[PDB]
Structures are given as structure tokens and as C-alpha cells.
Design brief:
Blueprint lengths: L3 E4 L12 H11 L2 H4 L1 E3 L6 H4 L5 H8 L10 H25 L5 E4 L21 H13 L4 E5 L6 H6 L6 E8 L24 E6 L9 H19 L3 E6 L18 H11 L7 E5 L5 H15 L9 H4 L5 H14 L17 H6 L2
Parallel strand pairs: 1-2, 1-3, 3-8, 4-5, 4-7, 5-6, 7-8
Helix pairs in contact: 1-10, 5-6, 8-9, 8-12, 9-10
The structure holds the ligand O=C(c1ccc(C(O)(O)C(F)(F)F)s1)N1CCn2c(-c3ccccc3)cnc2C1, potassium ion (2 copies) and zinc ion.
The site of zinc ion has 6 residues, from loops.
GO molecular function, one term: DNA-binding transcription activator activity
Subcellular location: Nucleus; Cytoplasm
Family: Belongs to the histone deacetylase family. HD type 2 subfamily.
Length: about 350
């Protein structure tokens, strides 16, 4: 059926008392959303597929079985094996959407991938699943234009690295930055790409700390002023999302700190669905509060299926973005007005609420 796809595999589970992916899968079952989707069969990525992004030595070290107590080193060996499986699960879903076998999809996968660099694992990431999917779309299907949006609260340093000189992949990261003082320390607004890729790396970097925390109004405004204008101009053929949910309320000060609602991610998904004819796949990255990530996963899948979304509260729709967010947005727009026509014509309305922007448009 031409509908929303899912990928999940119990071989990614730590114990071989529900973790993140098992809790997300259960929510999708209980809500009936799983029943409306096509769950596909995953597989291991090949060593060759992993090597579109990573070095041979890196792939051989972490991608090969050496031949489980979760408190022993063999937990990490298993996590690296789980990563190899996660990459193949994401690749399979991405290809089924990109070929039109399925409409769109959500990959319920772990570990996350977006921090893993060419020959360096880090931040719980061994292999960059989303980047590998994107490399294979280019190499195997000659996809002309790919948008990667990364809305995990931490900068996707691996994904930025993988495509930094490539103008055929637009990488857009929304993340807490605070002038270099938040993990992993990369993703300054000034980082715009290199070579022919100049202008095709967009760091929507929030600065100013938690005075106050960023919330729905701030992210909605960032989508309005930076993400959607730039993404629309680019006009991608396929959209991939590194969908971390650690920006949702309930994630404390270093491993989070923002107070987005799960409902807001549904709306952010629906916005991205207006691009690439609806050819969009989300892949789980970070987030750890089980209620928050299950709520968020539910909102996103519901949106992908075309279900009517729970309205955002009137308060959120009427809220002007906080001063630090406005400053952050305006710095990014200023930098990227050099490369994008949608940022050259105008004056900033980043300080308007959604309703005000709508009224005044
Ligand atoms: O911020 C992270 C994250 C790494 C990866 C993160 C992610 O982006 O959410 C991912 F990969 F899961 F998606 S978030 N850190 C910094 C703090 N930290 C810690 C802490 C240790 C002591 C006190 C506070 C945090 C352990 N491990 C980490 C890695
Ligand atoms: K990000
Ligand atoms: K790029
Ligand atoms: Zn994160």
C-alpha cells in the first residue's frame, strides 16, 4: 500500500523493562498508528555502504563481529552491531520512499548517528545512518537535490562534515549553540560550507542560554523565517530528517534544556511534508525521556499519515519569540542573505508571533 512506512528491529534492543525504541514501538501499537502503516524488513548495512561516509578502518573496527551483560564492554560491541543494523534499516526505508513504493516514513532506530564522523565515533554514535542513506541516494539513484533537516537539540557534526563541500545536499541544523558552549561545540552560524558547497550548510544556532529556554514559538518562528524559505528555494527531491526529540520539555539542562511540546513536532513534520512532493523520512536520533519521545513520535507519525493534528494552544500561536531567539534568527538570516534570494528582498519579522505573521502577510 502507498502509505506511511515504519522500520523497527528487536535485534537493535540492548537486552538480548522497555528502552527508547521499544517504548516508541509500543506507543505506535497502542494508539493504532502502527496498524495504519507498512512496517518493512530491515537489514545490516554492508561494509561498502558504511564506507560512503566512513573510513575503511573505522568500518572494519566497529562493523565486524569479534566472534550479554549490559554492564560489560560487550554492551558496546553490541551497540556497534546495533548501529550497523540501524544504518541498513534507515537505508531500506529511505529507498522505498524515494522510489515511491511508500509515501513517507519513520525509522524507529538506535543508536543515533548524527555525531559519528568519518573515522571517529562519538556522542553515542558509531555510524551516520542518515548521511549514508543520502550518499546512496546520490550514488545509486542519482538524486539531484536532498534536504537534510536535523532538529535534535545538539548539532549534527557528522552530517555537516559529510556534505560540507557538496551543494547538492542542503544541511539545515536547528540546535542549542550558546556561542560554542554546548555539546558537541560545533555548528556556529558562520559555518556555511566550503568550495562549491558554500551557502548549502545552514546552522540555525540558538544562543543566549536558558534566559528563557527556547520553546514552540521560537522553533515555529525559526521555521517561518529561516528553514522553510531556504528549503523552498532549494526545492529538494527528497527530505531526510535526523529527528531527535531532546528539545521536548522534560529533558534537563545539559541533556536538553528546552521546553518544546511533542505536538509542535507534528506541525514541524507537516511543514516539511510540503517539500519534495511529500517524499520525507524521519530517523530517530536523540531524546531520552520516555513520555516525551513517545508523545513526539506519535505526533510525527500521525502527521505523516495525514491525520488532523491536535491544534497548538492559542497562547503558543499568539506568543512572540523571546529576544535571544530573535537575535539568533536575525544573525543566521544576515549571514545567509548572501546566498539565498528569499533573504535578500526583505526586513526581519522574526519577532512576530505566528498569528501576527499570518495577519501581516
Ligand atoms: O550531550 C551529550 C550528548 C551526546 C549525544 C547526544 C544526542 O545528540 O542527543 C544523541 F546522540 F543521542 F542523539 S547528547 N553528552 C554531553 C553530556 N554527557 C554526559 C554527562 C556527564 C556528566 C554530567 C552531565 C552529562 C554523559 N555523556 C554525555 C554526552
Ligand atoms: K540539530
Ligand atoms: K552541504
Ligand atoms: Zn541530542
Amino acid at each position: 500500500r502507498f502509505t506511511t512506512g515504519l522500520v523497527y528491529d528487536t535485534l537493535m534492543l540492548k537486552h538480548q523493562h522497555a528502552g527508547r525504541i521499544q517504548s516508541i514501538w509500543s506507543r505506535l501499537q497502542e494508539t493504532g498508528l502502527r496498524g495504519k502503516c507498512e512496517a518493512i524488513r530491515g537489514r545490516k548495512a554492508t561494509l561498502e555502504e558504511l564506507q560512503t561516509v566512513h573510513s575503511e578502518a573505522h568500518t572494519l573496527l566497529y562493523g565486524t563481529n569479534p566472534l550479554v551483560d549490559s554492564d560489560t564492554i560487550w554492551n558496546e560491541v553490541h551497540s556497534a552491531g546495533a548501529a550497523r543494523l540501524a544504518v541498513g534499516c534507515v537505508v531500506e526505508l529511505v529507498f522505498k520512499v524515494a522510489t515511491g513504493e511508500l509515501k513517507n516514513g519513520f525509522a524507529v532506530v538506535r543508536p543515533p548517528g548524527h555525531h559519528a564522523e568519518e573515522s571517529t565515533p562519538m556522542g553515542f554514535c558509531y555510524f551516520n545512518s542518515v548521511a549514508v542513506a543520502a550518499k546512496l541516494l546520490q550514488q545509486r539513484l542519482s538524486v539531484s537535490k536532498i534536504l537534510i533537516v536535523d532538529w535534535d537539540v545538539h548539532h549534527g557534526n557528522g552530517t555537516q562534515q559529510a556534505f560540507y563541500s557538496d551543494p547538492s545536499v542542503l544541511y539545515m541544523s536547528l540546535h542549542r549553540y550558546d556561542d560554542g558552549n554546548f555539546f558537541p561545540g560545533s555548528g556556529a552560524p558562520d559555518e556555511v560550507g566550503t568550495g562549491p558547497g558554500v551557502g548549502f550548510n545552514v546552522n540555525m544556532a540558538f544562543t543566549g542560554g536558558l534566559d528563557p529556554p527556547m520553546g514552540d514559538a521560537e522553533y515555529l518562528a525559526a521555521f517561518r523565517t529561516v528553514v522553510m524559505p531556504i528549503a523552498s528555494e532549494f526545492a529538494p527531491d527528497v527530505v531526510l530528517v535526523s529527528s531527535g526529540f531532546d528539545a521536548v520539555e522534560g529533558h534537563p539542562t545539559p541533556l536538553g534544556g528546552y521546553n518544546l511540546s511533542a505536538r509542535c513536532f507534528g506541525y514541524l513534520t507537516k511543514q516539511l511534508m510540503g517539500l519534495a512532493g511529500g517524499r520525507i523520512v524521519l530517523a530517530l536520533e536523540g531524546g531520552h525521556d520516555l513520555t516525551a519521545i513517545c508523545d513526539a513520535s506519535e505526533a510525527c507519525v500521525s502527521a505523516l499519515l495525514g491525520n488532523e493534528l491536535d491544534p497548538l494552544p492559542e497562547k503558543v500561536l499568539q506568543q512572540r519569540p523571546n529576544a535571544n531567539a530573535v537575535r539568533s534568527m536575525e544573525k543566521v538570516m544576515e549571514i545567509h542573505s548572501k546566498y539565498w534570494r528569499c533573504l535578500q528582498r526583505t526586513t526581519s519579522t522574526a519577532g512576530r508571533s505566528l498569528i501576527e505573521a499570518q495577519t501581516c502577510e
